[PDB]
mmCIF file of C-alpha atoms and ligand atoms in Angstrom:
data_model
loop_
_atom_site.group_PDB
_atom_site.id
_atom_site.type_symbol
_atom_site.label_atom_id
_atom_site.label_comp_id
_atom_site.label_asym_id
_atom_site.label_seq_id
_atom_site.Cartn_x
_atom_site.Cartn_y
_atom_site.Cartn_z
ATOM 1 C CA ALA A 1 -0.258 -0.064 0.017
ATOM 2 C CA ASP A 2 1.081 3.317 -0.899
ATOM 3 C CA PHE A 3 -0.005 6.048 1.319
ATOM 4 C CA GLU A 4 0.678 9.934 1.509
ATOM 5 C CA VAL A 5 1.469 12.951 4.149
ATOM 6 C CA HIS A 6 0.695 16.340 3.478
ATOM 7 C CA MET A 7 3.434 18.879 4.736
ATOM 8 C CA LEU A 8 0.795 22.029 5.708
ATOM 9 C CA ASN A 9 1.571 25.557 6.451
ATOM 10 C CA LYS A 10 -1.876 25.174 8.194
ATOM 11 C CA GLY A 11 -4.237 22.117 8.818
ATOM 12 C CA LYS A 12 -6.673 21.162 11.006
ATOM 13 C CA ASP A 13 -4.316 21.024 14.295
ATOM 14 C CA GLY A 14 -3.394 23.972 13.565
ATOM 15 C CA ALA A 15 0.127 25.688 12.397
ATOM 16 C CA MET A 16 3.019 23.665 10.745
ATOM 17 C CA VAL A 17 1.472 20.590 10.405
ATOM 18 C CA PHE A 18 2.263 16.771 8.984
ATOM 19 C CA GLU A 19 -1.394 15.431 7.786
ATOM 20 C CA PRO A 20 -2.086 12.770 8.102
ATOM 21 C CA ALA A 21 0.086 12.982 12.019
ATOM 22 C CA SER A 22 -0.294 9.439 12.945
ATOM 23 C CA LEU A 23 -0.423 6.395 10.241
ATOM 24 C CA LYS A 24 -0.565 2.827 10.952
ATOM 25 C CA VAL A 25 1.161 0.794 7.915
ATOM 26 C CA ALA A 26 2.226 -2.904 7.315
ATOM 27 C CA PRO A 27 5.880 -3.642 6.555
ATOM 28 C CA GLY A 28 6.839 -3.073 3.310
ATOM 29 C CA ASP A 29 4.281 -0.115 2.775
ATOM 30 C CA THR A 30 5.836 3.471 1.403
ATOM 31 C CA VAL A 31 4.690 6.707 2.745
ATOM 32 C CA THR A 32 5.686 10.038 1.013
ATOM 33 C CA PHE A 33 5.489 12.875 2.106
ATOM 34 C CA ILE A 34 4.302 15.705 -0.318
ATOM 35 C CA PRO A 35 5.507 19.721 -0.400
ATOM 36 C CA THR A 36 2.026 20.489 -0.584
ATOM 37 C CA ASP A 37 3.479 24.138 0.777
ATOM 38 C CA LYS A 38 7.307 25.186 0.544
ATOM 39 C CA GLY A 39 10.038 25.146 3.774
ATOM 40 C CA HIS A 40 9.207 21.374 4.696
ATOM 41 C CA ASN A 41 11.212 18.421 5.006
ATOM 42 C CA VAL A 42 11.081 15.048 7.001
ATOM 43 C CA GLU A 43 13.283 13.634 9.550
ATOM 44 C CA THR A 44 13.430 11.432 11.964
ATOM 45 C CA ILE A 45 13.880 12.874 15.188
ATOM 46 C CA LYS A 46 16.498 10.948 17.574
ATOM 47 C CA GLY A 47 15.037 8.350 19.477
ATOM 48 C CA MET A 48 12.312 7.407 17.704
ATOM 49 C CA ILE A 49 12.693 4.512 15.294
ATOM 50 C CA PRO A 50 12.684 0.865 15.433
ATOM 51 C CA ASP A 51 15.810 -1.468 15.444
ATOM 52 C CA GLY A 52 16.657 -2.499 11.895
ATOM 53 C CA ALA A 53 15.514 1.226 10.575
ATOM 54 C CA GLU A 54 17.986 3.667 8.978
ATOM 55 C CA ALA A 55 17.910 7.507 9.763
ATOM 56 C CA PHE A 56 16.547 9.443 7.360
ATOM 57 C CA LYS A 57 16.173 13.428 6.151
ATOM 58 C CA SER A 58 14.940 14.838 2.863
ATOM 59 C CA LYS A 59 15.596 18.213 1.471
ATOM 60 C CA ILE A 60 13.651 21.024 1.989
ATOM 61 C CA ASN A 61 10.225 21.117 -0.826
ATOM 62 C CA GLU A 62 12.317 17.184 -1.768
ATOM 63 C CA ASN A 63 8.720 14.933 -2.459
ATOM 64 C CA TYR A 64 10.151 12.160 -0.567
ATOM 65 C CA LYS A 65 8.911 8.655 -0.688
ATOM 66 C CA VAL A 66 10.077 5.769 2.072
ATOM 67 C CA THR A 67 9.124 2.037 1.886
ATOM 68 C CA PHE A 68 8.942 1.183 5.511
ATOM 69 C CA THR A 69 10.542 -1.802 6.038
ATOM 70 C CA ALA A 70 11.571 -2.119 9.679
ATOM 71 C CA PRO A 71 8.737 -2.951 11.786
ATOM 72 C CA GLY A 72 7.946 -0.665 14.737
ATOM 73 C CA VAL A 73 7.312 3.589 15.728
ATOM 74 C CA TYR A 74 9.062 6.231 13.680
ATOM 75 C CA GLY A 75 8.882 9.788 14.671
ATOM 76 C CA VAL A 76 9.636 12.317 12.368
ATOM 77 C CA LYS A 77 9.666 16.053 12.252
ATOM 78 C CA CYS A 78 10.282 18.672 10.238
ATOM 79 C CA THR A 79 13.791 19.952 10.686
ATOM 80 C CA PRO A 80 12.878 23.612 10.596
ATOM 81 C CA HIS A 81 9.607 23.359 11.695
ATOM 82 C CA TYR A 82 10.398 21.401 14.664
ATOM 83 C CA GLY A 83 9.989 23.792 17.460
ATOM 84 C CA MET A 84 6.692 24.824 16.182
ATOM 85 C CA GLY A 85 5.501 21.179 16.714
ATOM 86 C CA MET A 86 5.670 19.885 12.853
ATOM 87 C CA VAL A 87 5.466 16.081 13.450
ATOM 88 C CA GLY A 88 4.052 12.842 12.958
ATOM 89 C CA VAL A 89 4.040 8.997 13.719
ATOM 90 C CA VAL A 90 4.401 6.331 11.563
ATOM 91 C CA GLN A 91 3.460 2.722 12.400
ATOM 92 C CA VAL A 92 4.868 0.079 10.980
ATOM 93 C CA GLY A 93 3.385 -3.272 11.806
ATOM 94 C CA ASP A 94 1.478 -4.419 15.359
ATOM 95 C CA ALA A 95 3.425 -4.378 18.585
ATOM 96 C CA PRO A 96 6.206 -2.261 18.378
ATOM 97 C CA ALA A 97 9.136 -2.738 19.984
ATOM 98 C CA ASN A 98 10.636 0.190 20.526
ATOM 99 C CA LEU A 99 7.713 2.045 22.074
ATOM 100 C CA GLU A 100 9.645 2.772 25.740
ATOM 101 C CA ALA A 101 12.886 4.664 23.833
ATOM 102 C CA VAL A 102 10.245 6.967 21.542
ATOM 103 C CA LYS A 103 7.956 7.459 24.117
ATOM 104 C CA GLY A 104 11.301 8.862 26.602
ATOM 105 C CA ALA A 105 12.867 10.624 23.717
ATOM 106 C CA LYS A 106 13.105 14.333 24.427
ATOM 107 C CA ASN A 107 11.249 16.914 22.138
ATOM 108 C CA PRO A 108 10.132 20.762 22.165
ATOM 109 C CA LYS A 109 7.139 21.630 24.510
ATOM 110 C CA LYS A 110 4.762 21.431 21.177
ATOM 111 C CA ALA A 111 6.301 18.305 19.207
ATOM 112 C CA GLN A 112 5.628 16.081 22.011
ATOM 113 C CA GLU A 113 2.129 17.086 22.289
ATOM 114 C CA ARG A 114 1.569 16.707 18.609
ATOM 115 C CA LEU A 115 3.643 13.096 19.278
ATOM 116 C CA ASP A 116 1.559 12.372 22.260
ATOM 117 C CA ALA A 117 -1.482 12.222 20.466
ATOM 118 C CA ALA A 118 -0.603 10.953 17.409
ATOM 119 C CA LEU A 119 0.846 7.947 19.543
ATOM 120 C CA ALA A 120 -2.253 8.059 21.572
ATOM 121 C CA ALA A 121 -4.147 8.013 17.763
ATOM 122 C CA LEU A 122 -2.240 4.664 17.132
ATOM 123 C CA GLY A 123 -3.480 3.089 20.725
ATOM 124 C CA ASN A 124 -0.118 3.546 21.841
HETATM 125 CU CU1 CU B 201 7.547 22.453 7.882
#
């Protein structure tokens, strides 16, 4: 399955958002991060990627397709807008094994708020 996440200046949850900010996929699915607004990118957050994943960081304005192979929870940010809370979560598979690290990872306040809401939306 191939999914899309929009990078937006304004969305349902306010300014500087990924929509959807919460997504559950299967191993081998893809997610494309779409630069619907300019000025955004996607980057994995420190501490928020599972065993066997590779860190990643797109270029600003890049239409960025990730194939998710390693199971677990991924926290992503927009690099410039991380302090404004531009973040999202992708869960790959069921029963993610890296929740403790994910939940303990440090983040700016607005980021943490949105991450925690994304995680709760995933039933995590
Ligand atoms: Cu951004």
